[PDB]
Amino acid sequence: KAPVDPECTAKVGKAHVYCEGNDVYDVMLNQTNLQFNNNKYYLIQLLEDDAQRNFSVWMRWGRVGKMGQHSLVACSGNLNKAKEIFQKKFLDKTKNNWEDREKFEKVPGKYDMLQMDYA
Amino acid sequence: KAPVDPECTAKVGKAHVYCEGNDVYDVMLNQTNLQFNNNKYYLIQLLEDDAQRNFSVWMRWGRVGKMGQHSLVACSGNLNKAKEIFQKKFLDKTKNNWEDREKFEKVPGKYDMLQMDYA
Amino acid sequence: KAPVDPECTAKVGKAHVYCEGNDVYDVMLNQTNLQFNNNKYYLIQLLEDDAQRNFSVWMRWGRVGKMGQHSLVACSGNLNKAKEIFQKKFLDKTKNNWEDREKFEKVPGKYDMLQMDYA
Amino acid sequence: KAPVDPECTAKVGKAHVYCEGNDVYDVMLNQTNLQFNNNKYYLIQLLEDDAQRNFSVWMRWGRVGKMGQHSLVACSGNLNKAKEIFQKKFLDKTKNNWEDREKFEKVPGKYDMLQMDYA
Amino acid sequence: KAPVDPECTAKVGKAHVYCEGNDVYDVMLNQTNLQFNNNKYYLIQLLEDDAQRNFSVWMRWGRVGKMGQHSLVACSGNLNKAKEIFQKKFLDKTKNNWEDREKFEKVPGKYDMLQMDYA
Amino acid sequence: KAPVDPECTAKVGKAHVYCEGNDVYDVMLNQTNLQFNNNKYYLIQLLEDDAQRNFSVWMRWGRVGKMGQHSLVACSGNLNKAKEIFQKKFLDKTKNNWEDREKFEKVPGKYDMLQMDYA
DNA sequence: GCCTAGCTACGTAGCTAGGC
DNA sequence: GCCTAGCTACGTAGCTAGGC
DNA sequence: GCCTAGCTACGTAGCTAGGC
DNA sequence: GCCTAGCTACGTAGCTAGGC
DNA sequence: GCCTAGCTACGTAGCTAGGC
DNA sequence: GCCTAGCTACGTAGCTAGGC
Ligand SMILES: [Cl-]
Ligand SMILES: [Cl-]
Ligand SMILES: [Cl-]
Ligand SMILES: [Cl-]
Ligand SMILES: [Cl-]
Ligand SMILES: [Cl-]
């Protein structure tokens, strides 16, 4: 129900966003500063293939309104590795831990979280 | 400390974002849906002139990464009118009341709030 | 077995060259004079529709190697009219009568007959 | 009275078509097939210089309405050689012998003879 | 021996510069000021037709190295009129009288006389 | 009061035309022949620096209305050398000696002197 | 109305394949 | 009026510097 | 009328020859 | 050598005249 | 490295102002 | 080999439809 980023052409149609309990490993970050001309995003998804137990972490970032750059990190069957990478990126960019996201608190000079719409 | 939108060229340098108690009348909204190609913003600011007790509500919206369209509604000394307009726009676009923003809860098909950075 | 001129787009696929006894009403004329820069053709076909007893005379002429101009004269069920038109054109251009074509003799300043190939 | 092909710029004004008894060594061939898109010519002339007893065979061929390609075969004073070349080309292209041209009969897939106009 | 200005296309080949005693009615004036960007000429010729007693005054002026503008004043048989016009132009432009040209003295802000070469 | 040629960009603003008694070492020559298409100038100036006893001879020549070509000959403190060069150029081009310029007489095929305007 | 991605409805340089 | 040097009032190819 | 070879009535890039 | 008028050695848009 | 706003470093059509 | 119809493999002006 949370869609694989359509820009991840290697995995779209072939994989789904990883879910565990209440955790959906899918997040859009955004940092907007009107004075300093900051207006950028960072998407992070932990993807599992539809066909087998094979994980990867997809990251895409850019100036808002651009495709920017991206990176797909292969993790094989190693879920823990993929969760570390996911969680560490989230922490690098927000200074909040992923498991504390219910109490997320924006830090100055780091990205905010943005809740996306799903169909 | 929260800057007047630089796109509001009529008021920038001449006015400040209105503050009262803990209320800063300045908000950035964002709605992003990857499936349906939604990627838009809506900024709302309640502005008070630096020189006198004169209020206006500034609104700017668009596809993210664009200047889009805008509207500056003059409210004279009528603060209540400006607060109504501000609060009603916020409610139209988020389905949350402005005074309940500490407990903001994103509604499907409406905009999320985004916390901006200030200098 | 003698093909309808492919340039006769109104009748091609829908009609055939008219035959009676040994008469095939299909002829290519050519007049070539190297000194006077004459190098032209004149095709005449008497066509009968495949679907019904309906006749027409198709004529196409030009500088050799060009589509030139043409004319399709509708004759309805009147075969005699179509034969007159056919035969009169042949006579105007060769000074030989159509029924004397076995003994055709080229007249100076008139067209020669040219035997085409059929598949 | 039968003109040297004007395209034979080496011999025109300097030579004439060779004649002997009733034989005029000058012929235009044409092959036209509307279905198979054949529409070509082949001219053959046996030329004798005006100044001396010197013969050549001129050949020009092409898509009708084009200059195509050509070949002038020098035969010196050897008339017999020039007659052989002339007659052999005629036979290759029509499957009729030159001396039987009064009874010429078009062969399917070979060229017809065309009588030209002279001034 | 003093040539009619070649730019006087109406009179060149048909007329000569007028002479009387030691007077040759032909003069080139020049005013050059390096500071004020003045660099202009004024030619005056009194012309008599070769064919008859018919006079005109030809004047041509411009920035040096340009054809500039000109004027040909018809004087009929009236020599005196032509001499007045000639002499008055000379005086307007040099502040010297024509008959005093042996003692010519350049006046500041007026043209100098320039002696041309003749063939 | 006689200006340094403005085209002498190395010396203009920094030097003056050399004067001694009644001698101003500054002259414009002009040769105009309407028949032979001669219309050229030659300027000669003997320049002394404003700052010190240092002389040079500046020459500029061309088709009238053009910057043409030029040459600045350095003479150091040697005034005599500069006077020789000046006077010799004048003589080469006019066939009159510089010291006889009060009685200047134009020679056929050599340049005339032209009196310039000063401010 | 605003805007623009991307599509539509052309044009064409020069390749290619078929006649000669 | 003529003429044209050189200036004015644009346009732009592609470099460069700053966000990401 | 149709068509187009080739001609007419231009324009111009840059060479060349003559002044300086 | 410098410079440039004007000439040379092209190219071409579209007119025109002759075949059909 | 990526990208592009906007700037830099030109070129120029045609206006304008000053000589004639 | 020659030639060229017509096709292929582009490019693009500006329309259009969908987000805002
Ligand atoms: Cl074919
Ligand atoms: Cl910036
Ligand atoms: Cl010359
Ligand atoms: Cl013709
Ligand atoms: Cl000026
Ligand atoms: Cl869409």
Side-chain angles (χ1 to χ4, degrees), chain C residues 12-98:
Chain C
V12 72
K14 301 164 52 162
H16 60 273
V17 167
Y18 181 62
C19 292
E20 203 184 305
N22 300 125
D23 268 43
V24 181
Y25 282 85
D26 182 13
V27 67
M28 177 57 87
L29 309 181
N30 181 295
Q31 190 180 317
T32 294
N33 188 312
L34 298 182
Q35 298 292 56
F36 282 24
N37 191 25
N38 303 116
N39 203 194
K40 51 183 181 180
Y41 70 87
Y42 203 110
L43 178 63
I44 323 172
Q45 305 194 316
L46 199 170
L47 303 174
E48 178 163 43
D49 294 358
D50 297 340
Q52 64 274 312
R53 187 164 188 283
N54 182 45
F55 303 103
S56 58
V57 181
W58 169 249
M59 293 138 105
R60 176 158 69 86
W61 59 88
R63 184 75 175 187
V64 298
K66 305 278 160 38
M67 292 312 100
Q69 290 176 286
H70 60 259
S71 163
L72 184 68
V73 181
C75 293
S76 317
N78 197 333
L79 179 50
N80 188 65
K81 173 172 169 160
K83 281 152 81 149
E84 267 148 14
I85 291 166
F86 186 98
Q87 288 177 344
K88 187 43 158 51
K89 186 59 67 189
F90 180 86
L91 174 53
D92 292 337
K93 301 313 182 184
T94 66
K95 276 245 285 167
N96 292 232
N97 293 302
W98 177 248

Side-chain angles (χ1 to χ4, degrees), chain E residues 25-91:
Chain E
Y25 282 85
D26 182 13
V27 67
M28 177 57 87
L29 309 181
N30 181 295
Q31 190 180 317
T32 294
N33 188 312
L34 298 182
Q35 298 292 56
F36 282 24
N37 191 25
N38 303 116
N39 203 194
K40 51 183 181 180
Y41 70 87
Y42 203 110
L43 178 63
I44 323 172
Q45 305 194 316
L46 199 170
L47 303 174
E48 178 163 43
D49 294 358
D50 297 340
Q52 64 274 312
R53 187 164 188 283
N54 182 45
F55 303 103
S56 58
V57 181
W58 169 249
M59 293 138 105
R60 176 158 69 86
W61 59 88
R63 184 75 175 187
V64 298
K66 305 278 160 38
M67 292 312 100
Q69 290 176 286
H70 60 259
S71 163
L72 184 68
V73 181
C75 293
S76 317
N78 197 333
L79 179 50
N80 188 65
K81 173 172 169 160
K83 281 152 81 149
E84 267 148 14
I85 291 166
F86 186 98
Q87 288 177 344
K88 187 43 158 51
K89 186 59 67 189
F90 180 86
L91 174 53

